[PDB]
Ligand binder design. Structure first.
Ligand code: R5X
Ligand code: R5X
Ligand code: R5X
Ligand code: ZN
Ligand code: ZN
Ligand code: ZN
Ligand code: ZN
Ligand code: ZN
Ligand code: ZN
Lengths: 515, 511, 510
């Protein structure tokens, strides 16, 4: 579709980098039991010291170089400790009279690294990659990691190493071309390499969409990006416009976008396996391209209206999952990637606080607050999802700011109507190392959504547990299907690092794959 | 006339039910001095006990049933008391060996029940109707009530009994019996109560109706339909006509709305010599966002602001009653400058200087004080009609909640006699109103440096008075009274409108 | 009796000025008929034009040719009568003596209101403050009744007077009045002087900072005043207050370094008493709001020395009553005085306390301390067996949103008493508007654990809710309540009005 402009300078597409520097890195995996070769670039050892905290550095691996081995001997390394995050640079000449660069990153004293500890290690490693024109990196694992944590290492490395310069003009300014990995039982880890590279881009793709400003990323331009992505992955796609949405009676969703200059666009991507189907899955993401709050404008102190381009993070995660799925191509499964995309703006055309609107399932809704627009969009999307006749419906959304008060910035919350699906989401959490916590849908609060005139209240008057109340509202639009709700309002944006996380991509993909 | 839409799913008319289940209730009034008979349905005795606070229940009236009488002996009822709001249900077999349902509502210990108390009696009575599949209700009055309070009982019964389900997707009684002393005089109050009931309930339907349904176009269409179902003269002034009349203050407010301004002018004329011409003016803001002075502050309650046309709803509800009852020797003008206060590129700005139809220039200090601007141009219009009385009713100021609260509306004005008539009408209609002053000392704070007058005050925080001072500037030589119903229009506890003003304005017109 | 100190530099008494320069002003009142003489000082004509912003015209005959020439229509039409506008010129008279002549515009409306007359006086006083005059002469070319005339003199005296007790690093001696029917107005002159000081005495107490005016020193002041006027007096200390079981009032004062002090002054007539009145004044020397601290924007904690304006008004009334000495009445001047502070000893939000009438009270907001002190004061008052009880208090900030800064609110349980107040408002020219005690709001004060709530959680009609509360503490006596929170302090002029002295005095005398 054509993107409407106010001025000719208004951008008419989202800039997207497909071919990243990371994709050009050749990755080699070796077994430690054959010894380490130390040559060009930077060679880093991941070292810990179990039990003794801040203990001295010891190098276990055999180094196939007499000079370097002498340098890395215990007597020399004892002056350094393994405090998690610590790093050191070494400079020396090898057996062939060439200058080599060696070093280590401390992995603390705990034998089992959490997904957070791993991130801290990688961030230390990225520091060594930044402001250094290296042609090759070599990593030597002298720590115990399982296959999932190893993959997570690579993904995190690839993600943090990458730098988004899509909107830089006058302020720019060499990535490595080779990445060597030494690890015990290397043959058992090689399979994770390309999985990591695929999970990397799915996450980085979502990141680009979330980071892109609302004048670049609007409902028309975003849906366009989905079409382009589907075309590149040979996914079936359907983009529903206003005329189709009207006949489908999506009144709740249509109301939210009334005050926007950009018409509503409902994204429907489908991946179907070439084998007989055993499971049908619907993935629904909240896709508000900008959330101004509507007439309930985000004007209160700490409402953070400048962050509100983030409000399509759920849609981004789902599209990123679409990349991972359409690339890895899982068998015997059919997936629907769905998003009701629109923009919540203030206008003469906007919907009002107090308005009564009718969702596609016939339920009438009294809007008590226009800044609770996400559940309204999701309502019509959930009805759409169930109509597809699937086994699982999973939605992911930056729905409630209360999540920052419940689980904070590290853990997402999962709600649902089916315990087994919840457990499946939680298993996907562990294998993707994207932390999620199970929160209740307390039915005692349901009565507060009883409207005097409408079928149901959008919001509660009394209950301050908005994350739970919102889940109660969504559950009203899934009649008889296993359904889960993931709230990523707290974890989607990395506040200290000033960038998106692309949270949800790897989690949803593990869910699809391990089922 | 055609309602503009953004999407096809947008409503283009206000759903209105005219024939309610309350209209299907056959009402009979008997005199108690002949006996009560029971039989079918539920029979409720309104009882009290003068003197003793929680004194025993004593059924004094004669019951035309040996069984029911034996059950209603003093000794049997002695265990019950008459605490205001107390209710009980009884089961027994009458002389016909048929199961009958009997009970009572406690009417306290005071000989003269108050408006607030009578509503408490009714609500307790309505509770008995909501959870039971009854085909008939019988109410026996063993308390003293005058004709007005009796009518009030019926109105309040009818109002609280009726349930609005216009906006829901996913068994009323058919008979009402009333036993009462001096029944023949109370009989005429019945159909008057039915008329007062709907005028009130018509108003509430409009107010309760959300702002996507009730817009300046649909509301004015509803008024035309009402005018046509009665036979009042009607004319809806459009933007073009309003421009020719130079109603700039009124036109400014609606600038940011997707709905064109509609000025409602209804007229009732008696078929005889007119001795009094009256102009009723209702504030008709279908939705009040506040304009660029957006309602964002804690406690501004923006999601309620569909009620900001309660003044118009009150005026239309009165038009129905007047249209139905057809009073004599009067000519009534039902006026409302309807528009919507929205945020847009076309909206008017704080600081803007606008020109009223009487030529006075106005400096806008706050866009959320928009009611008095539409009223100003409506008052100019009303006085040009050459009337004897101008009365406006409006949800104008939030300060009312801090002055009089949620029960008592405030009345302002430039003529004591007119105020006295409004206060009198407040008594007989049982819609409480308290007289508040227009303090002229505060007028100096409406002096502008550039415009002829300021919209809002600089220093004074008594906005309900300051607003009254602003309104008075647009009535040069006609008795005028102002009724602020911003405090009383919405029943917060019940989460519904009161339809406040309909009965007051009708009592004012009739008498 | 002895005022406690934290440091030796802390004040131990309220400075009071009794003999003011106003008392040194010799006032003569002449009839306009016969013409006006202009010989010394300033002569101001009070002129109107019944049109708007119309020209100035002097109707009165001036027995001086030079001034007459200055006052001819051709000269005066250059000026206008816009309410409060003034001009004055210096010139020589027939005797070649320096005189000053001018006018104050009185607008275009024939009957001046109390607000209008104040703007006129303020324009008059402006000329007084920047001219070294020996004599002011005011010629009334407007119509004023006896009451408005006396009100003119009181307001003139009050605005003219400058309080300088707290300043560290030449009033006129003669006042002349030309007015039609001068004889009927002369008797109002000395009454004005009395009403002025009663108002000024009160203002002196309100303006006095909270470190000067504390529970102890304020009660000490009341005794000093009571002795000068030969009124009997009684100051109740904490021990008495404890034996009287005044828990509501004692609770509020718990966090203060200053012990609670209950002021009880009594005026008795030599003639057989036929009416007994008790006047109750809110006496909070400082109101920080307690643990419910006044910390919200616009809570104006720096004003809160005014929170004893009610007590000041009562004492101001006591001066007038003791001076004019009315007959056949016994008046009781009451005030439960204390301070509302934050401390380890303070009363907390939530506390349930017992008033002297046995009613348990759940404290929902420590800043609503006024009604608690008033509760035990009203209980004390009824025990005196009086016919009328009138309390006057800076009780609710909501008054600023109802009536504003000019009209005080009056509540009550007896229609005749309220009307007597409303009439006193008319004759004292201190504006008061009747407000309703809505019984339908009473149910919000039903405590879950106490007999009654201190405040309402829902209803925002604070003045009415507070009226319902106080109503619970008067069982069988005519009682009226005057909320002067909005009108007590003159914000524009940055000073007290001493509001209520003249109102209550007119109530006692008439
Ligand atoms: N009680 C009540 C009332 C109205 C809105 C909410 C609410 O949860 N609002 C959310 C919203 O705007 N959804 O569209 C909302 C608000 C803030 C964030 N946020 C996340 C990170 C930083 N801020 C996320 C979602 C709740
Ligand atoms: N001084 C000044 C400044 C700006 C607004 C007002 C003012 O009176 N605003 C009113 C308004 O919006 N009129 O259109 C207003 C405000 C609130 C309510 N309210 C009623 C129930 C709950 N709230 C009603 C009317 C006055
Ligand atoms: N419900 C409830 C809660 C908390 C305070 C009040 C209240 O009315 N408080 C009054 C008080 O502090 N009394 O001691 C009070 C009295 C006067 C003002 N005022 C402001 C400016 C001029 N005067 C403000 C508050 C009521
Ligand atoms: Zn929102
Ligand atoms: Zn949102
Ligand atoms: Zn408004
Ligand atoms: Zn309004
Ligand atoms: Zn206080
Ligand atoms: Zn106080």
């Amino acid at each position: 579709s054509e993107v409407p402009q106010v001025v000719s300078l208004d951008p008419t597409s989202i800039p997207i980098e497909y071919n990243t520097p990371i994709h050009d890195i050749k990755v080699q995996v070796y077994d430690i039991k054959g010894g380490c070769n130390v040559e060009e670039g930077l060679t880093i050892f991941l070292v810990n010291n179990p039990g003794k905290e801040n203990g001295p550095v010891k190098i276990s691996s055999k180094v196939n170089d007499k000079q370097v081995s002498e340098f890395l001997k215990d007597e020399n390394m004892e002056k350094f400790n393994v405090k998690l995050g610590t790093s050191k640079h070494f400079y020396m000449f090898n057996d062939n009279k060439n200058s080599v660069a060696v070093g280590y990153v401390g992995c603390g004293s705990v034998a089992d690294l959490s997904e957070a500890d791993m991130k801290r290690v990688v961030l230390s490693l990225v520091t060594m990659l930044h402001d250094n024109k290296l042609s090759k990196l070599t990593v030597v694992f002298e720590i115990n990691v399982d296959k999932n944590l190893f993959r997570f290492f690579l993904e995190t490395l690839f993600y943090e190493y990458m730098t988004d310069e899509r909107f830089k003009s006058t302020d720019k300014n060499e990535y490595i071309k080779h990445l060597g990995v030494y690890i015990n039982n290397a043959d058992t880890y090689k399979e994770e390499v390309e999985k990591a590279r695929v999970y990397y881009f799915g996450t980085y793709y979502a990141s680009q969409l979330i980071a892109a400003p609302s004048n670049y990323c609007n409902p028309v331009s975003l849906s366009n990006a989905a079409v382009e992505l589907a075309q590149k992955l040979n996914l079936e796609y359907k983009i529903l416009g206003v005329k189709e949405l009207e006949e489908l009676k999506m009144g709740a969703y249509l109301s939210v976008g009334k005050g926007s200059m950009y018409p509503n666009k409902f994204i429907h991507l489908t991946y179907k396996s070439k084998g007989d189907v055993k499971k049908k899955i619907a993935l629904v993401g909240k896709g508000i391209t900008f959330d101004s709050g509507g007439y309930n404008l985000k004007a209160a102190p700490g409402s953070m209206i400048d962050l509100m381009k983030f409000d399509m993070s759920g849609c981004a995660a789902v599209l990123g999952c679409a990349y991972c799925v359409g690339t890895l191509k899982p068998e015997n499964v059919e997936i629907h990637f769905l998003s009701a995309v629109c923009e919540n703006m203030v206008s003469k055309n906007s919907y009002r606080p107090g308005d009564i609107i009718t969702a596609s399932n016939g339920k009438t809704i009294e809007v008590g607050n226009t800044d609770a627009e996400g559940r309204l969009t999701l309502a019509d999307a959930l009805v759409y999802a169930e109509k597809l006749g699937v086994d699982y419906i999973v939605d992911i959304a930056t729905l409630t700011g209360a999540m920052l008060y419940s689980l904070g910035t590290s853990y997402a919350g999962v709600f649902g109507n089916n315990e087994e699906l919840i457990n499946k989401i939680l298993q996907s959490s562990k294998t993707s190392n994207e932390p999620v916590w199970w929160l209740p849908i307390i039915n005692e609060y349901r009565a507060t959504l009883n409207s005097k005139y409408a079928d149901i209240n959008q919001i509660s008057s009394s209950v301050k547990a908005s994350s739970i109340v919102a889940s109660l509202f969504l559950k009203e639009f899934v009649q008889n299907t296993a359904w889960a709700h993931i709230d990523i309002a707290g974890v989607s944006w990395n506040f200290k690092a000033r960038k998106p996380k692309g949270f949800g991509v790897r989690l949803l993909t593990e869910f699809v794959l391990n089922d």
